[PDB]
Amino acid sequence: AIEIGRICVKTRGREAGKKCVIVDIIDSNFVLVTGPKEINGVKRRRVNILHIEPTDKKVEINKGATDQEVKQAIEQSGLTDFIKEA
Amino acid sequence: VKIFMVRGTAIFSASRFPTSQKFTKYVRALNEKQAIEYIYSQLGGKNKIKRYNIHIQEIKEVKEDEITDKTIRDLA
Amino acid sequence: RPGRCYRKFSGPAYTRREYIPGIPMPKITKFVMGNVNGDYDYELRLITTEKGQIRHNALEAARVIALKYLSKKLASEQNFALVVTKYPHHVIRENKMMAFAGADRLQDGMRLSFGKPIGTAARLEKLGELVMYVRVKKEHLEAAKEALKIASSKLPIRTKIEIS
Amino acid sequence: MNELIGVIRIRGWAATPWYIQDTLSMLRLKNAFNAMIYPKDSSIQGMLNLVSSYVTWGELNDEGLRLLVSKLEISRGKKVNEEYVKDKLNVDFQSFVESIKDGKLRLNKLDEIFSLPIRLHPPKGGFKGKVSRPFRAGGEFGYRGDKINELIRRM
Amino acid sequence: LKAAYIREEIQIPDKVKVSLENNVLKVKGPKGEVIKDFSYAKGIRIQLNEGKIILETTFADRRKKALLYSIIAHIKNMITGTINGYRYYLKVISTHFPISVKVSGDEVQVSNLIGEKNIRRAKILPGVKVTVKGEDIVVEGSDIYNVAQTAANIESSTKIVGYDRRIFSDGIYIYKKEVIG
RNA sequence: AGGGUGUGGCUCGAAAGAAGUGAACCCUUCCGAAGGAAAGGGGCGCAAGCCCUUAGUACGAGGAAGGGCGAUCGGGGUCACG
RNA sequence: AGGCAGCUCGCGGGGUAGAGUGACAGAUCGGGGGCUCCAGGCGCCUGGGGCUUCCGGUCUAACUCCGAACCCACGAGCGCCGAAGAAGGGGGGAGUGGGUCACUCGGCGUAAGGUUGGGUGGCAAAAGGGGAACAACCCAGACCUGGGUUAAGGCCCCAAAGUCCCGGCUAAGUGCCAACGAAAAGGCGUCUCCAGCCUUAGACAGCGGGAAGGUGGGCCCAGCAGCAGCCAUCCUCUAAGGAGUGCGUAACAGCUCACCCGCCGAGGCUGGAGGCCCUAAAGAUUGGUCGGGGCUCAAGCCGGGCGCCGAGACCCAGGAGG
RNA sequence: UUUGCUACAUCGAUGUCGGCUCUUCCCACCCUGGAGGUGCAGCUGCCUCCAAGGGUAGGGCUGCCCGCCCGUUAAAGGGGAG
């Protein structure tokens, strides 16, 4: 499901297969996402809900969490390198 | 997230009524460029209006705690 | 003859009576009905949205039906004032010779094809011209929209109704 | 108001009206994609407003101007006894300017006035790079202003 | 307009076992069991909570929200059917020639209408019980559609009196619903 | 349906056409007009994609040199497919 | 040794589109005041007629107190041609006097691939590239051979290049049409923008009750005991009601018309316009349609974007001729 | 499917009315089939919607076509194909 905290995989764009965390719901077809410490860095901007694939893993954050705040939640669940478990 | 309120005149054969059900709209988007593109596509698609005939006059961010319509409040 | 023949403009305005002999009398004779100078609240109007011509037959039938409807509601001299504004100045003419003179080997075919007058019409040269209006009080606003809708059915041009 | 403009004929000469074809011959634009340099004054402006549907023009800057003068070829130099001598060096300018032009004794002192029919190439990347019609009012023809300089770089 | 979020809850009462798997929802109860497929409800998430049914959809237009509220009414009909039965009544109205009706397996046979020798026959849907008391016909069952369709087949077969004659009220007609049983 | 072209099959080829003073076909190097990339690295966009570097590089019609093999090519008739 | 097919500036010419009608000539719809005659009624009132005055409204190919864009004469300047390709003068030879279509401004006509005028352009006398095929529409002017880049148009397959990207709509195979095939009317079918009016001091819909009394007042009537022929209009009242609808009925009666209670607890109602679609929408020269296959978050339509393919056009190399 | 209007095609020829013979098609439905409304009791009527699978005949009068008339019939529909 697509809700706040879900970890997704980018389908289109130059990112194309990188970890990504949903942090906000913008409108009917856009959400706000960010990549805290991607090796190249998934920047903090919008993405179309058709260009992402939700995974099964999830974190616990608040709506519109800052980038620093998100990094603390992935390490709490130990997802810093556990992203590639699927 | 910056809820925006876009106001302006759109034309079909001398058509101008600046109030709230044949003239203007409300939009929720990150910046002003995104909000304008939404207005062009929604009015151009649903009413067959080319971008010559859409005259946007005022765009400004409104505070989320004061909106007349509750449809845009519910997805916040 | 079908109204599609004399609904479009074909040529200039043809009105000068001194150069045109033998014009039939128009069907419309009374253009103002009711009690003008009465005290009224609403002044709703019938406005065209195209350019064209309206025959004097269409203009008289749209008037009888509207007057009968309003007079059916309450009374005649009572609070309504029905006014039709345009006059049929233009003269429409038909090459009738296809009927009689087109079969005597007389000037048949398109030979000597200038036509003879058959009636009059109202040229509508602007977009949004007033054709009729009716004035009533506040209690009769509804029976006045319906009178103008029924009258709009017997006219060639597409119209609206405006309230003021 | 810049002091120097460049105009390019972007259509061919078949089925062109009487008035228009004669004006383009006075501006030296006989067939498609040849350019010419003129000073900006009220006399030339009224000519471009007549043949607007067949040309595009605007004000040159240093990069557009320097690039037009370099493009000359064997039948495209200036009237060095006609012959359109390809400049390619100051050698032609060390002996030709001594008739009508003045102060031009080096390729870096050729910035003042006049030229000949500069024959160009169609634009790289599609003349429909962002358009679909050279036939549309301002869609691709007419006055474009400073944008005429990036179009010259493509051709 | 687009309703951003809409969510509804259906309470599962006691003595009812609700199972949901691959969009098929079956409800088991004292009176019987009902099985219904909801594969046509696109854009709607059906959640099987521990004590209630959860239906959710987002950004519903006039056609997606019309669908959602019909699924709600269907589910509440399944719950009711397995706790209380459904009972429709039909009345037998005759003018001159008495009408004889009898049940034979999965068919109802109506004979001696306004006088005709043809025998009118009506299908009986599965899981439905039809009995004749007198001047009345009683249709039983748990699935409301099967109970309603069966009583309507009896209704439709005897209409044919309604051909070529000004109606003088001769036929079998639906009467009421919903006894506690 | 019918001729012209491209690629193939089978046939005729003494002379008048080229050719052992070397036909035809294969390798290597060099120059190169107008035009002209991509992979890699970095940045921007929801996206298709774009911008800087790679780089006017690789390439590119034509043209010039060398090596190998060595006897057919041009031309005629007809058939298949585009 | 000058010339003018174009433009600018200067200086002049004009009565078209429009606009007006108290500025002339004609037409043309209503109201107020004053004067007069006639007719009717009991000096007055009402109607018709004529003149005058004031206020508003509708028109003109053969009306004008006005008046654009625009076109044109002359002078200067610019631009181009010119002593290689030459203003004015002289001489030899013709052909032509059936045109036609598209766009645009008209006259006649119900119209016409009609007929007759003004301006521009093709064809005639013009290939090649697109439009399914196509004298005339769009691109474009072909000396010969090779290489490249584009225009019109296109990119699911036939068939070179996108099963390209974003926001929306349509359920009819609508549609997949520049020139080429659909009107008035109806649809809250669904999608959108404006108005106005009611809403937590509990709206809309619904549900139970009060759902009414003097009186069923009444005139006329055996009786219409709202609603058969004209019509008023009063409080035991407060958290409640009007002297009151459609049915109907010989007449009733009664349901319903209208106001409060009780519940309920989120928004509701009425007008205006727009998009697409549906009905309107029926033929045969014989046998199914966007060219065909086929296509449904599209391979359709609306508002935008990105990249490619594609002429003999333009660029380059070699050759030929005047 | 009439009658006109135009003068695009055929003037070194496309045999020009009616009838008979034979074939096929359209639907805007006359009968046969289905459904409904009615100022539909029944019988008979009138009207609206679907539907072209089958049928639609014999004679008197006139060169006819149209039309009038005779005795029947479920009905004795109306048009196209140079």
Side-chain angles (χ1 to χ4, degrees), chain E residues 1-2 61-63:
Chain E
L1 61 83
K2 309 283 298 306
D61 66 298
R62 204 157 188 284
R63 262 183 211 120

Side-chain angles (χ1 to χ4, degrees), chain A residues 41-58:
Chain A
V42 173
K43 329 166 205 175
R44 184 165 165 112
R45 45 192 185 121
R46 65 162 174 174
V47 70
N48 205 326
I49 62 180
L50 303 168
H51 304 172
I52 62 194
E53 303 267 9
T55 50
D56 44 358
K57 57 179 70 65
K58 191 172 178 294

